[PDB]
Amino acid sequence: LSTSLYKKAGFDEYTKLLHDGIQPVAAIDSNFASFTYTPRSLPEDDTSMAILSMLQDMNFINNYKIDCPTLARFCLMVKKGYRDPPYHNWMHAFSVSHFCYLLYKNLELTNYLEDIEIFALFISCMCHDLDHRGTNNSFQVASKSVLAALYSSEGSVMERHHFAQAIAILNTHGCNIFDHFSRKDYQRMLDLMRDIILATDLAHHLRIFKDLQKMAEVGYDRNNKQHHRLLLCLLMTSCDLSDQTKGWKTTRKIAELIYKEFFSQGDLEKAMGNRPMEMMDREKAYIPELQISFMEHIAMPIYKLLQDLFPKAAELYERVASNREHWTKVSHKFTIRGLPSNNSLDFL
Amino acid sequence: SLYKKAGFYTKLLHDGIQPVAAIDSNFASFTYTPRSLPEDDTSMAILSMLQDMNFINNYKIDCPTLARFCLMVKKGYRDPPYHNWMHAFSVSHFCYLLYKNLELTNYLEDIEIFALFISCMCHDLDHRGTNNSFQVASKSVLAALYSSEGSVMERHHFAQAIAILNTHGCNIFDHFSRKDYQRMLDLMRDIILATDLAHHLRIFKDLQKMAEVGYDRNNKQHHRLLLCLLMTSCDLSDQTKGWKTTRKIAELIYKEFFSQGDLEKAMGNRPMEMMDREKAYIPELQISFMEHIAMPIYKLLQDLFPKAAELYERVASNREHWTKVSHKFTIRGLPSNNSLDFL
Numbered sequence: 001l002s003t004s005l006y007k008k009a010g011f012d013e014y015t016k017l018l019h020d021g022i023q024p025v026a027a028i029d030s031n032f033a034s035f036t037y038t039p040r041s042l043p044e045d046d047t048s049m050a051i052l053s054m055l056q057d058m059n060f061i062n063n064y065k066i067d068c069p070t071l072a073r074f075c076l077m078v079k080k081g082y083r084d085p086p087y088h089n090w091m092h093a094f095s096v097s098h099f100c101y102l103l104y105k106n107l108e109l110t111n112y113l114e115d116i117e118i119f120a121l122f123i124s125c126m127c128h129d130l131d132h133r134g135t136n137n138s139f140q141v142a143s144k145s146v147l148a149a150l151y152s153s154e155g156s157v158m159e160r161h162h163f164a165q166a167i168a169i170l171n172t173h174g175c176n177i178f179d180h181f182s183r184k185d186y187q188r189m190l191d192l193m194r195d196i197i198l199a200t201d202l203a204h205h206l207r208i209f210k211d212l213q214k215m216a217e218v219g220y221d222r223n224n225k226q227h228h229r230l231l232l233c234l235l236m237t238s239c240d241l242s243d244q245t246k247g248w249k250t251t252r253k254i255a256e257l258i259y260k261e262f263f264s265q266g267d268l269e270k271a272m273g274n275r276p277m278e279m280m281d282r283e284k285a286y287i288p289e290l291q292i293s294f295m296e297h298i299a300m301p302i303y304k305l306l307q308d309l310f311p312k313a314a315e316l317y318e319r320v321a322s323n324r325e326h327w328t329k330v331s332h333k334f335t336i337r338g339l340p341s342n343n344s345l346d347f348l
Numbered sequence: 349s350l351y352k353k354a355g356f357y358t359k360l361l362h363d364g365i366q367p368v369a370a371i372d373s374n375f376a377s378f379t380y381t382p383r384s385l386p387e388d389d390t391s392m393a394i395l396s397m398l399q400d401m402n403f404i405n406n407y408k409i410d411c412p413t414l415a416r417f418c419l420m421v422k423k424g425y426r427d428p429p430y431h432n433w434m435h436a437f438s439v440s441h442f443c444y445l446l447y448k449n450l451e452l453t454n455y456l457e458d459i460e461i462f463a464l465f466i467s468c469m470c471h472d473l474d475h476r477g478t479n480n481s482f483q484v485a486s487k488s489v490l491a492a493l494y495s496s497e498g499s500v501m502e503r504h505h506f507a508q509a510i511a512i513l514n515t516h517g518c519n520i521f522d523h524f525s526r527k528d529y530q531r532m533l534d535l536m537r538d539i540i541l542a543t544d545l546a547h548h549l550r551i552f553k554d555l556q557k558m559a560e561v562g563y564d565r566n567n568k569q570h571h572r573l574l575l576c577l578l579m580t581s582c583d584l585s586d587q588t589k590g591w592k593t594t595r596k597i598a599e600l601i602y603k604e605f606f607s608q609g610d611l612e613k614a615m616g617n618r619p620m621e622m623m624d625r626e627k628a629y630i631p632e633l634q635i636s637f638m639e640h641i642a643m644p645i646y647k648l649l650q651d652l653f654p655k656a657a658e659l660y661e662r663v664a665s666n667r668e669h670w671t672k673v674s675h676k677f678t679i680r681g682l683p684s685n686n687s688l689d690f691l
């Protein structure tokens with residue numbers, strides 16, 4: 001059960017981060033603003049600077065007169081706010097935030113959303129899985145956790161906690177990046193962060209799914225407030241599952257990370273005398289079939305809606321579909337349940 | 349189903365703050381019926397209650413701003429039979445009664461009691477005389493804005509309260525520190541959202557556990573749960589009054605509910621039985637509502653506060669009165685004149 005222990009580095013580098021100023025994105029990588037960039041390739045120590053670089057390149061620092069030392073401290077607090085499970089760690093939040101930046105650069109989001117909405121989307125991406133324990137919402141309820149005691153009646157247990165952790169960082173002395181905003185705009189930011197983070201609960205996505213389809217059918221209306229809110233939910237889910245839009249090496253490695261995390265939850269449930277979900281049981285789970293189901297029923301419909309709303313997003317949908325075909329190829333040359341004994345899918 | 353908004357002061361500035369005994373010698377008693385106060389005297393009574401609980405002095409509230417805030421809240425209610433200003437006023441009066449009769453200061457922080465009172469005033473702002481299910485069914489702008497997150501009307505009531513605070517010269521918390529201003533908004537959000545019966549149903553077991561284990565003032569969750577319980581006890585406080593009050597409030601509630609059912613039928617949808625004047629049997633519905641909803645809230649209050657026993661006994665007595673009078677109420681819906689005086 002030791003593989004279920006995921007530590008926090010601190011409790012709920014700064015001058016060093018701003019010593020040479022904020023780096024222009026092209027200096028980080030000429031491919032930084034491309035859908036072919038793999039943000040998980042960036043060294044972890046360079047991710048805080050890349051966050052500042054993206055906020056600078058999207059002109060949020062200048063447009064909102066964000067204090068750079070406060071932003072640097074906020075970025076470091078958010079990074080330190082993640083534990084170290086195989087998948088739900090800072091590198092996942094960083095990669096999700098990078099995808100938000102890619103949508104801004106490639107889909108020209110400023111023609112669909114308000115500046116404040118795009119800013120909130122990016123901050124929400126950074127914060128959206130804060131303090132994740134490597135377990136799902138059902139586990140919180142089963143383990144009778146403090147998080148389930150605080151939030152289980154309302155659903156979205158972990159997501160309500162991620163939002164609460166994001167707010168606690170803003171409330172930390174020297175970390176409130178938007179404390180200069182008007183009362184109306186500060187409230188708008190908090191409401192946006194709450195809605196966007198809560199949109200990462202798959203149960204929420206499934207409830208609003210028919211409304212997202214209706215919006216894609218009738219066409220996006222930039223004057224429709226509900227369309228802005230539905231679009232932010234869609235974009236957030238697309239950032240959260242963006243590893244599926246990268247190359248085969250990325251989808252293969254992320255299956256390794258997802259199933260190492262899920263199987264550790266399954267082992268922990270068995271230790272507690274409970275029968276875990278099939279996808280979390282290393283003795284029952286058949287990864288290629290589970291991956292094909294996730295891709296066909298959860299990921300591909302999100303990128304299909306994205307393509308329906310933004311023709312320039314067609315390449316993302318095509319890549320997700322291509323990765324699904326690669327998993328179908330794998331299913332005719334993968335004869336094991338769970339992960340291999342060495343916990344590696346490198347042989348694929 | 350048409351209920352209007354009156355819009356989009358000197359009398360209050362001159363004599364808005366009165367000693368509560370001058371309003372009525374029984375003003376601070378559980379046997380006072382706040383609906384007996386003339387509507388034109390309610391804003392003065394709100395200021396008088398805030399003065400009597402010493403919030404005006406303790407929080408350095410600007411009295412002209414407070415008078416403007418009270419007037420804005422009063423104009424913020426429409427005129428359906430039940431969900432109007434007199435309901436908000438009577439709910440606010442009950443909060444004042446809990447402060448005066450129970451030892452609230454021994455359970456909650458002054459800021460939380462203050463937020464409870466202001467939330468009582470605002471908790472049904474701009475109510476349309478329809479429930480949350482109706483907002484979704486009618487595909488309203490409120491449902492478009494809030495249905496995906498839950499508690500459509502309650503999120504709207506809180507948004508309306510915030511809009512009043514943001515109105516020129518009505519911000520009663522203007523001088524508060526940034527941290528305290530935010531605490532007030534968070535408390536108002538949590539307390540107003542606690543008025544959705546769906547929320548109460550979801551947290552009942554946790555309220556049932558806090559009372560079983562015993563109230564812990566050092567437990568932040570116990571403060572949150574207690575505020576939810578207190579807010580629902582204020583919302584249903586008409587049930588703690590005399591039989592005449594319970595009977596009149598049934599006339600108001602069902603005239604409003606039946607108007608929603610008539611509207612649903614006009615839209616080609618079948619309303620729930622309780623909103624259908626052709627199906628609803630008021631005594632049976634009220635006995636069920638008192639057994640499942642009202643009585644357990646006051647029983648929890650009695651378990652946490654011994655002085656609250658009379659509240660539960662009155663609710664139980666009113667439920668027994670519905671059973672005894674059911675033999676004389678031989679019809680579904682309401683009589684042609686919408687009155688229950690015949691009982």
Ligand SMILES: C[C@@H](c1ccc(C(F)(F)F)cc1)n1nc(CO)c2c(=O)[nH]c(=O)[nH]c21
Pocket residue numbers: 199200201202203205236237240241242243244254255258294298
């Ligand atoms: C954590 C989960 C997940 C998060 C978030 C949402 C949404 F859409 F609701 F935001 C859905 C699902 N998740 N993330 C991945 C990474 O590709 C995978 C995966 O490969 N297989 C899964 O069974 N679940 C996965």
Ligand SMILES: C[C@@H](c1ccc(C(F)(F)F)cc1)n1nc(CO)c2c(=O)[nH]c(=O)[nH]c21
Pocket residue numbers: 542543544545546548579580581583584585586587597598601634637641
């Ligand atoms: C509006 C509704 C109601 C509001 C609020 C809450 C709570 F508890 F959640 F706050 C519960 C229920 N309500 N109010 C009354 C008046 O005493 C009655 C009634 O007598 N019969 C009903 O069926 N519903 C009634």
Ligand SMILES: [Mg+2]
Pocket residue numbers: 128129158200
């Ligand atoms: Mg998450």
Ligand SMILES: [Mg+2]
Pocket residue numbers: 471472501543544
């Ligand atoms: Mg209400």
Ligand SMILES: [Zn+2]
Pocket residue numbers: 092096128129200240
């Ligand atoms: Zn995530």
Ligand SMILES: [Zn+2]
Pocket residue numbers: 435439471472543583
């Ligand atoms: Zn009410």
